[PDB]
Ligand binder design. Structure first.
Ligand SMILES: [Mn+2]
Length: 664
RNA sequence: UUUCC
């Protein structure tokens, strides 16, 4: 297709994305920035002692605890699935350059031999059925907003009062805005109600990424991460180039005088997108009720909490297949957006709301700073949104879009390769709805537990079982993609939402158990994705509000990992060698301090009652709110704790809004 | 804070 139009920041189309206030203006111009993070209060990620510690711990653990993953990617034994060199990154310093987001993924999908629409009428009915079951009998709830999160385009406000006003105003004018859009008046909808414009593209760190130690050379090698330059991004890959970013950290020495030990690299950086809040609010007001519905009625498939919660479902299976999806967000198909919108209209959803929804999935993107001297460019024209970026992480229902796509993708996979006998049950909408309603409740011989791009597919005893083994074998072979919709493979070291499925000698689900991933404990403790932001007075607004609290939930979260004790002892030993102090004592102090600080934020919490009323989930979330995005949901956290991290808009205002959106 | 869901 055509190249997407691009506008420099000086152009009026990009200028219009940033309000006439300092924050917005600074956000538009912010140049590439890097620097060591404050891993913990008073400790830099590049502190010589800390890097020495990481070098000793990483080698030691890898040495003594080699991965235990079989030929089918099932993990067993020590519950270790890879080496421990992932911790060897100079946290805060990114690979250069970060990628330019692809303005269109049509070609990327076509070239990967993925379909440009439902391949059969059956699939078409299943995707639409997914829409009818998910968006049908919704109950209004307060629109909850994350504290400290930015409203992005055009105001970039982080003020709760301002966010609540923006959100309330948005639920009030959404109808008018959507109708303007239905008339092709996007500039009007944006100018009047700030609904439109673009996603603000930021780069986030994936603090740990694969690193291997070459036996032959004795040198460490970081996994190459391919990035697209501007030409490639605007032409959907027809021109320009895709090349490996540089993770080499040598530069830190001459540039900053930072000492770079051997085998330490710059961090992998991923794109994140901040949505224009006025547009997302009306979307989030529907999205939450949808989540509430699927996590309740379809809890079997979609509601995952503890490792035992997962385990109970999986141990009833005769076969469990741990899938992997390649680059889910960028391959997400715009045809599914259009299918979902079309089906919502068929269900009687307000056209103006569906239009807001459709538009949220075609919005231009404003690229900030992928590298020194690059960026500050708007891709796509906000006057007529027509990008096909795949799925924007900042869209108000991103989790649901990925979940709807994949859940049906896996079911189709199970039907195609193992359960032809179930096809006669999917003949029209009613029967498709009935079958999907039953499958999602775990009532069929083929099952799944999934979230966005993570899942485990199951087969009980029955006719499909033999096909299930063939599918598994096909995946192991890795020669033929089992799906026409996304690039599916098997996970090397099967895990689901953070918990590794630990298999015994029988290599069967019934005798397998879910254990915490010890490598994630290390990632969270020694390679956080953000510094402690000690300059942000209000801790509820920080990326890591109460880092110390994770120590109190550690045993609960990682206690079942086979080498749990071993890792804690190796840490203690190496921290001793590097700092001359006890890591455990260090964490107990942090734990006490954050525990005291926390009572300042929790009203119900006695001005010093312990952590007695808090669950392990509560703790992990207070230390890392991001887990409330990729792992758990509001309902999994104690109510008094939830209020620490979120604030809501009146139920009355959303109720009125929701009534005007929904069919009946 | 220096920008996400
Ligand atoms: Mn998985």
């Amino acid at each position: 297709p055509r190249r997407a139009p691009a506008f420099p920041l000086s152009d009026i189309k990009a200028q219009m994305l940033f309000a006439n206030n300092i924050k917005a203006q600074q956000a538009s111009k912010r140049s590439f920035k890097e620097g060591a993070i404050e891993t913990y209060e008073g400790l830099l990620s590049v502190d010589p002692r800390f890097l020495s510690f990481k070098n000793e711990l990483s080698r030691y653990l890898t040495d003594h605890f080699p991965a235990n993953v079989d030929e089918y990617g099932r993990v067993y034994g020590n519950g270790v699935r890879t080496n421990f060199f992932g911790m060897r990154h100079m946290n805060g310093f990114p690979m250069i350059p970060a990628t330019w987001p692809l303005a269109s993924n049509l070609k990327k999908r076509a070239d990967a031999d993925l379909a440009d629409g439902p391949v059969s009428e059956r699939d078409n009915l299943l995707f639409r059925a997914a829409v009818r079951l998910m968006f049908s009998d919704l109950e209004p709830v307060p629109l909850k907003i994350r504290k400290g999160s930015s409203t992005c385009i055009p105001y970039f406000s982080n003020d709760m009062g301002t966010k609540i006003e923006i959100a309330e105003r948005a639920l009030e004018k959404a109808e008018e805005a959507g109708n303007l859009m239905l008339q092709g008046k996007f500039d009007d909808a944006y100018q009047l109600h700030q609904m439109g414009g673009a996603y603000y593209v930021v780069y986030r760190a994936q603090s740990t990424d694969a690193i291997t130690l070459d036996p032959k050379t004795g040198k460490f090698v970081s996994k190459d991460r391919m990035v697209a330059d501007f030409e490639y991004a605007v032409t959907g890959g027809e021109q320009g180039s895709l090349f490996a970013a540089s993770k080499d950290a040598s530069r830190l020495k001459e540039q900053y005088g930072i000492d770079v030990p051997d085998g330490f690299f710059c961090e992998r950086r991923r794109t994140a997108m901040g949505g224009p809040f006025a547009l997302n609010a009306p979307i989030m007001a529907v999205a939450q009720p949808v989540r509430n519905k699927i996590y309740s009625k379809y809890a079997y498939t979609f509601h995952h909490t503890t490792r035992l919660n997962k385990e109970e479902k999986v141990k009833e299976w005769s076969l469990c297949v741990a899938t992997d999806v390649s680059d889910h967000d960028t391959f997400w198909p715009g045809w599914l957006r259009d299918l979902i919108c079309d089906e919502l209209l068929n269900m009687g959803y307000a056209p103006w709301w569906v239009k807001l929804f459709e538009t949220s999935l075609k919005l231009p993107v404003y690229v900030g700073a992928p590298a020194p001297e690059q960026g500050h460019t708007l891709l796509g024209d906000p006057s007529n949104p027509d990008l096909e970026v795949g799925l924007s992480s900042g869209q108000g229902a991103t989790d649901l879009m990925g979940t709807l796509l994949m859940s049906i993708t896996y079911l189709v996979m199970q039907l195609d390769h193992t359960a032809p006998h179930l096809n006669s049950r999917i003949k029209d909408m009613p029967s498709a709805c009935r079958f999907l309603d039953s499958y999602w409740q775990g009532h069929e011989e083929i099952r799944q537990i999934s979230k966005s791009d993570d899942a485990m597919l199951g087969w009980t005893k029955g006719r499909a079982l033999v096909g299930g083994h063939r599918l598994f074998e096909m995946l192991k072979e890795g020669k033929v993609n089992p799906s026409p919709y996304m690039k599916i493979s098997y996970e090397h070291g099967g895990a689901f939402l953070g918990d590794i499925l630990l298999y015994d000698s029988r290599r069967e689900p019934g005798s397998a158990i879910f254990v915490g991933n010890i490598n994630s404990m290390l990632n969270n403790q020694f390679s956080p994705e953000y510094g402690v932001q000690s300059g942000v007075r209000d801790r509820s607004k920080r990326k890591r509000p109460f880092p110390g609290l994770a120590w109190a939930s550690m045993k609960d979260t990682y206690g079942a990992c086979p080498i749990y004790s071993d890792v804690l002892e190796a840490i203690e030993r190496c921290w001793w060698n590097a700092f001359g102090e006890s890591y455990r004592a260090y964490r107990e102090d942090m734990l006490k301090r954050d525990t005291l600080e926390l009572s300042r934020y929790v009203a119900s919490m006695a001005r010093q009652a312990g952590l007695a009323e808090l669950t392990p989930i509560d703790l992990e979330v207070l230390a890392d709110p991001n887990k409330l995005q990729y792992k758990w949901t509001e309902a999994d956290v104690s109510a008094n704790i939830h209020e620490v991290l979120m604030h809501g808009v009146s139920v009355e205002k959303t109720e009125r809004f929701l009534r005007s959106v929904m069919p009946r």
